[PDB]
Write a protein that binds this ligand. Structure first.
Ligand code: WKN
Length: 134
């Protein structure tokens, strides 16, 4: 057993709050906000050795990142930002920082009861997205 066992699996979005406002704060344009905000992604998390993979599959976009904790990587986000990302585990929470154009946003993933809760923060704006096992 290891670091991220409780995250591994296939998860489906069941609720979202304030995501349009988060996307506005990030700089996502109108059309992308509308289509992205409609999506009901599945999130697939797996681990092989030290490499964690997070896939997001939806009608909007299919994305995949693979990474080692603490080791920076280049990421093209679903809204087409080219960012430098670093993901760490802090007290059982996966903390994903993205940097681009002198800006920064943090995405936290945590297990709470049977859910996987995703908190996205840009400056003062937070969005909460709740996923359940598929
Ligand atoms: C533009 C954008 C910003 C932030 C995140 C962070 C996040 C939220 C979540 O539920 N998983 N990851 C995702 C994203 O794009 C997508 C939106 C919907 C479906 C697929 C991709």
């Amino acid at each position: 057993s290891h670091m991220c066992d409780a995250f591994v699996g296939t998860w489906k979005l069941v609720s979202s709050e304030n995501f349009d406002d988060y996307m506005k704060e990030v700089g996502v344009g109108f059309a992308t906000r509308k289509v992205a905000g409609m999506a009901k992604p599945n999130m697939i998390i797996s681990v092989n050795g030290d490499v964690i993979t997070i896939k997001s599959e939806s009608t909007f976009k299919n994305t995949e990142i693979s990474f080692i904790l603490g080791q920076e990587f280049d990421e093209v986000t679903a809204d087409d930002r080219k960012v430098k990302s670093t993901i760490t585990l802090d007290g059982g929470v996966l903390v994903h920082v993205q940097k681009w154009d002198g800006k920064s946003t943090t995405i936290k993933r945590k297990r709470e009861d049977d859910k996987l809760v995703v908190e996205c923060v840009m400056k003062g704006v937070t969005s909460t997205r709740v996923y359940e096992r598929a």
